[PDB]
Design an enzyme around this catalytic site. Structure first.
Site, PDB file in Angstrom:
ATOM      1  N   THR A  60       0.817  -1.199   0.000  1.00 12.97           N
ATOM      2  CA  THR A  60       0.000   0.000   0.000  1.00 12.97           C
ATOM      3  C   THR A  60       0.857   1.258   0.000  1.00 12.97           C
ATOM      4  O   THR A  60       2.001   1.278   0.467  1.00 12.97           O
ATOM      5  CB  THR A  60      -0.927   0.028   1.234  1.00 12.97           C
ATOM      6  N   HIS A  61       0.245   2.336  -0.482  1.00 12.30           N
ATOM      7  CA  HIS A  61       0.649   3.710  -0.167  1.00 12.30           C
ATOM      8  C   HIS A  61      -0.610   4.374   0.404  1.00 12.30           C
ATOM      9  O   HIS A  61      -1.391   4.988  -0.325  1.00 12.30           O
ATOM     10  CB  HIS A  61       1.129   4.498  -1.388  1.00 12.30           C
ATOM     11  N   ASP A  90       4.309   0.847   2.196  1.00 10.09           N
ATOM     12  CA  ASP A  90       5.548   1.349   1.592  1.00 10.09           C
ATOM     13  C   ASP A  90       5.737   2.819   1.953  1.00 10.09           C
ATOM     14  O   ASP A  90       5.723   3.707   1.106  1.00 10.09           O
ATOM     15  CB  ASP A  90       5.456   1.123   0.085  1.00 10.09           C
ATOM     16  N   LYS A  92       8.420   4.171   3.573  1.00  8.23           N
ATOM     17  CA  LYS A  92       9.776   4.702   3.422  1.00  8.23           C
ATOM     18  C   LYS A  92      10.142   5.655   4.567  1.00  8.23           C
ATOM     19  O   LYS A  92      10.617   6.776   4.359  1.00  8.23           O
ATOM     20  CB  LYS A  92       9.996   5.364   2.054  1.00  8.23           C
ATOM     21  N   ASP A  95      13.417   9.414   8.711  1.00  8.10           N
ATOM     22  CA  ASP A  95      13.615  10.506   9.653  1.00  8.10           C
ATOM     23  C   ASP A  95      14.444   9.972  10.830  1.00  8.10           C
ATOM     24  O   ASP A  95      14.811   8.785  10.895  1.00  8.10           O
ATOM     25  CB  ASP A  95      12.247  11.097  10.056  1.00  8.10           C
ATOM     26  N   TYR A 210      12.374  -0.543 -15.716  1.00  8.22           N
ATOM     27  CA  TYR A 210      11.829  -1.885 -15.560  1.00  8.22           C
ATOM     28  C   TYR A 210      12.804  -2.976 -15.978  1.00  8.22           C
ATOM     29  O   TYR A 210      13.563  -2.830 -16.948  1.00  8.22           O
ATOM     30  CB  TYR A 210      10.502  -2.056 -16.325  1.00  8.22           C
ATOM     31  N   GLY A 228       3.332  -2.819  -9.888  1.00  7.50           N
ATOM     32  CA  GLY A 228       2.236  -1.864  -9.862  1.00  7.50           C
ATOM     33  C   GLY A 228       1.558  -1.777 -11.216  1.00  7.50           C
ATOM     34  O   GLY A 228       0.709  -2.614 -11.539  1.00  7.50           O
TER      35      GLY A 228
HETATM   36  O1  LIG Z   1      18.577  15.621   9.821  1.00  7.26           O
HETATM   37  C1  LIG Z   1      17.439  15.873  10.288  1.00  7.26           C
HETATM   38  C2  LIG Z   1      16.329  16.145   9.532  1.00  7.26           C
HETATM   39  C3  LIG Z   1      15.151  16.447  10.155  1.00  7.26           C
HETATM   40  N1  LIG Z   1      15.017  16.480  11.557  1.00  7.26           N
HETATM   41  C4  LIG Z   1      13.714  16.869  12.149  1.00  7.26           C
HETATM   42  O2  LIG Z   1      13.897  18.063  12.898  1.00  7.26           O
HETATM   43  C5  LIG Z   1      13.234  17.955  14.182  1.00  7.26           C
HETATM   44  C6  LIG Z   1      14.265  17.898  15.279  1.00  7.26           C
HETATM   45  O3  LIG Z   1      13.570  17.974  16.506  1.00  7.26           O
HETATM   46  P1  LIG Z   1      14.326  18.134  17.911  1.00  7.26           P
HETATM   47  O4  LIG Z   1      15.384  17.078  17.994  1.00  7.26           O
HETATM   48  O5  LIG Z   1      14.847  19.548  17.970  1.00  7.26           O
HETATM   49  O6  LIG Z   1      13.198  17.889  18.872  1.00  7.26           O
HETATM   50  C7  LIG Z   1      12.349  16.714  14.102  1.00  7.26           C
HETATM   51  O7  LIG Z   1      11.033  17.019  13.637  1.00  7.26           O
HETATM   52  C8  LIG Z   1      13.073  15.845  13.089  1.00  7.26           C
HETATM   53  O8  LIG Z   1      12.174  14.979  12.427  1.00  7.26           O
HETATM   54  C9  LIG Z   1      16.104  16.224  12.314  1.00  7.26           C
HETATM   55  O9  LIG Z   1      16.088  16.268  13.523  1.00  7.26           O
HETATM   56  N2  LIG Z   1      17.287  15.909  11.656  1.00  7.26           N
HETATM   57  O1  LIG Z   2      13.127   1.424  -5.633  1.00  9.32           O
HETATM   58  C1  LIG Z   2      11.876   1.465  -5.526  1.00  9.32           C
HETATM   59  C2  LIG Z   2      11.194   1.411  -4.339  1.00  9.32           C
HETATM   60  C3  LIG Z   2       9.827   1.422  -4.351  1.00  9.32           C
HETATM   61  N1  LIG Z   2       9.076   1.496  -5.541  1.00  9.32           N
HETATM   62  C4  LIG Z   2       7.596   1.448  -5.463  1.00  9.32           C
HETATM   63  O2  LIG Z   2       7.146   0.287  -6.148  1.00  9.32           O
HETATM   64  C5  LIG Z   2       6.022   0.613  -7.003  1.00  9.32           C
HETATM   65  C6  LIG Z   2       6.435   0.494  -8.447  1.00  9.32           C
HETATM   66  O3  LIG Z   2       5.267   0.645  -9.226  1.00  9.32           O
HETATM   67  P1  LIG Z   2       5.255   0.394 -10.810  1.00  9.32           P
HETATM   68  O4  LIG Z   2       6.373   1.184 -11.416  1.00  9.32           O
HETATM   69  O5  LIG Z   2       5.356  -1.096 -11.019  1.00  9.32           O
HETATM   70  O6  LIG Z   2       3.905   0.943 -11.175  1.00  9.32           O
HETATM   71  C7  LIG Z   2       5.576   2.016  -6.603  1.00  9.32           C
HETATM   72  O7  LIG Z   2       4.577   1.995  -5.582  1.00  9.32           O
HETATM   73  C8  LIG Z   2       6.854   2.641  -6.071  1.00  9.32           C
HETATM   74  O8  LIG Z   2       6.571   3.651  -5.125  1.00  9.32           O
HETATM   75  C9  LIG Z   2       9.735   1.538  -6.717  1.00  9.32           C
HETATM   76  O9  LIG Z   2       9.169   1.566  -7.786  1.00  9.32           O
HETATM   77  N2  LIG Z   2      11.124   1.539  -6.677  1.00  9.32           N
END
Ligand SMILES: O=c1ccn([C@@H]2O[C@H](COP(=O)(O)O)[C@@H](O)[C@H]2O)c(=O)[nH]1
Ligand SMILES: O=c1ccn([C@@H]2O[C@H](COP(=O)(O)O)[C@@H](O)[C@H]2O)c(=O)[nH]1
Ligand code: NA
Ligand code: NA
EC number: 2.4.2.10
Lengths: 256, 256
Positions: A60-61, A90, A92, A95, A210, A228
């Protein structure tokens, strides 16, 4: 040497979610994951019901589902139990650990409540896994690490891929395998799932590339194809799913 | 040599969203982005209203908001317009181009409808940017690329960071800057925003690492500090925001 899916499901270090998946793959003769890339809940559920017997997994997405509710995911679980497939969101996750734990458990999607599997990018370092596993371990879930990507210009190569493998193999209580284009771990307890799959050569106009099931399962040694548009955009999605299932299954048998 | 924020806002190649941000930074004497890492809409909105005058930007994770609705985001926009700050959804798009365009425009969050800025990981290759910009360019939005991360074990180093800079500088119609720990581009049209900031030394138990505003703005040359828990967990969030604003602003003035 190489073991069948059914024998891999019994390996000493197998994760329970991986074992469940491997057993249903062998039972049903499917190593196909449907990428259910649709925006309507009714279409998601109709695909899950009709294609359920043909798939080991439905990916899913949910952040593209215009009419997401938790009751949709309850319906999807009923179909997953009926037809015997795992649900893979999916998402991903990518953070810092403290953030991803909240994105996995909470918000409106409550992903951990319904997804057997999720995935994570390894770019933040291993805190991404540590954060997820704090939610996922109590909920008996598994995770896949993104070791390679299918798209043009992917930076998930070389030392990055090696770091993903090390991070998985050091978090085996939660990480059950990889998103990759090929076998990247030599440990048979880990699954390899490969997107970027169609029967015909080609790509899309936004960097997707592909390869065929025979290439990815047979020549590159992956376990599961993620498909997909090759299914979703076809008129008869059931026959398309069967074509992909048969392709991936025979490629697996012939490498075995 | 170095230009003020107000002069950078006039550079020939400046993006309109970057220009708007730079002008309000100079007007309000703030280079602080609040990381509004809360799960309740009422707390999000109360923080946005009280801290709005102190911030140039409010960064969201709407996927952790237990009571998200689009009407909450309409309220947030009203506060952003009133107090003059941009809204940055820290979604970390990190999929193939065809998927991220749908995650940006659609689903229940409709991020592009309310977020001035979003960000993306560069690991998929430049299709991630091409997919986003198909939605973001018509909606007059901007994007930040994640060139470095603050967490322990980050793989966003070396050639990966250089690839992020190249990808930004080749997509300047949409990409307005970076998430980074330091200045990574020598082009003054690009913003540098730095998370992992607290006044005191330390980290968290899931890989976060902190540096001070003086270090990141003054010694590392970044433009904006992103601060979550250093503000959010304090008793008086307004005074905490003022302490961080004053720290980041003086560090900027002294490097200028
Ligand atoms: O390299 C990164 C990229 C993004 N954040 C985001 O910045 C905020 C840091 O929060 P805090 O550690 O100041 O509470 C969070 O929302 C976190 O997801 C990081 O901390 N580091
Ligand atoms: O390296 C990656 C990782 C994930 N997806 C995911 O796999 C599906 C590929 O779909 P399709 O190109 O077969 O339609 C999508 O949901 C996409 O987000 C990729 O295509 N490549
Ligand atoms: Na199959
Ligand atoms: Na400031």
């Amino acid at each position: 040497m190489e073991l069948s899916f059914g024998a891999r499901a019994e390996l000493p270090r197998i994760h329970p979610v991986a074992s469940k998946l491997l057993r249903l793959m062998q039972k049903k003769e499917t190593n196909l994951c449907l990428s259910a890339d649709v925006s309507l809940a009714r279409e998601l559920l109709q695909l899950a019901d009709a294609l359920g017997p043909s798939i080991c997994m439905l990916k899913t997405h949910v952040d593209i589902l215009n009419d997401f509710t938790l009751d949709v995911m309850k319906e999807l679980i009923t179909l997953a139990k009926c037809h015997e497939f795992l649900i893979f969101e999916d998402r991903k996750f990518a953070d810092i650990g403290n953030t991803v734990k909240k994105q996995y458990e909470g918000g409106i999607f409550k992903i951990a409540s319904w997804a057997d599997l999720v995935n994570a990018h390894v770019v933040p370092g291993s805190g991404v896994v540590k954060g997820l596993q704090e939610v996922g371990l109590p909920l008996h879930r598994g995770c896949l690490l993104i070791a390679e990507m299918s798209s043009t210009g992917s930076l998930a190569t070389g030392d990055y891929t090696r770091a993903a493998v090390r991070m998985a193999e050091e978090h085996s209580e939660f990480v059950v395998g990889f998103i990759s284009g090929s076998r990247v771990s030599m440990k048979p307890e880990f699954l390899h799932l490969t997107p970027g799959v169609q029967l015909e050569a080609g790509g899309d106009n936004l960097g997707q590339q592909y390869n065929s099931p025979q290439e990815v399962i047979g020549k590159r040694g992956s376990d599961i194809i993620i498909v997909g548009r090759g299914i979703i955009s076809a008129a008869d999605r059931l026959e398309a799913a069967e074509m992909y299932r048969k392709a991936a299954w025979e490629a697996y048998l012939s490498r075995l």
